[PDB]
Design a protein around this ligand. Sequence first.
Ligand SMILES: NCCOP(=O)(O)OC[C@H](O)CO
Length: 327
Amino acid sequence: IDENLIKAAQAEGRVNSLAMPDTWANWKDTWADLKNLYDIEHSDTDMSSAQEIAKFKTEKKNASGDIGDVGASFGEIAVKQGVAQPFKTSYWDQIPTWAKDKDGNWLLAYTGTIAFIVNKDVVKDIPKTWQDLLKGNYKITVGDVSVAAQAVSAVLAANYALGGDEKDLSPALAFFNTLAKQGRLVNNDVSIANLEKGEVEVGLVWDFNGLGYRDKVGKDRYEVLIPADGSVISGYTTIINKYAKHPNAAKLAREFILSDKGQINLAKGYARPIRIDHITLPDDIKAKLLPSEQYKNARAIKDQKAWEKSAKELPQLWQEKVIVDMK
Ligand SMILES: NCCOP(=O)(O)OC[C@H](O)CO
């Protein structure tokens, strides 16, 4: 890690993040490490992907945030909105071509697979597939599709299970319209608070969040599983605000996140680090992960551009085809 970068980051003194809370994929260990290793302070303001891009845009130079983390379908939105500045990091060549742009404005640090988190007290017949969800009477916490990458991805995951792909989300929209009409949809995100209270019945979340949240709340209260009929694998990229007040500290954070230590932190949080092939993980992680068999129909996106387009159009379709029909 370049010494002038550490020095410039320390002169700034801190890094302000958006949507990088401690409870998400063990960002906790990473912010602790920046304080403990380079004396960089930090504070975060949680939100969803779409909101992070609008905030950097709205605030300009009087930026409340320096760095954010957004879903794979939003890297290009950040770029198109002019809120991203490039920083490839010293690990650029180990990042797969499908996981980054060409200039360094966005690059996935980790990936996950859409999963179900199920309340064992309320849901007696645990759903194992997307098809199973159509027959219960319990409430499905889908995520806020208007702004969250996790929720947008959950829709694509259902779409894959219904035999579609990232070029046309119509089958999944019909599936969610069906549930909306039954009065079984909850249009908010799963959170540790709503899991603690026992309010989530079936929730749609990344496996890493399902597992992380399960530890906080109780392993015997919630089951986490990958739907057997299909799911999506996708990931997240940091975005360094073009208008960051602390650009060097943001660059330092990104560099660290991609370093062996930041990648190990992500693994301890149950996510799959993008540089998994070049790091040695601790042996204890594997046993806390889900059975491999469950991932039998989980697939990555083949056409990034088609997904970017479908995802961008999804919020309006969600309002018009799902929200408007909620019982
Ligand atoms: N964590 C980066 C933003 O992730 P995103 O999936 O866009 O939002 C999730 C929502 O904020 C509930 O946790």
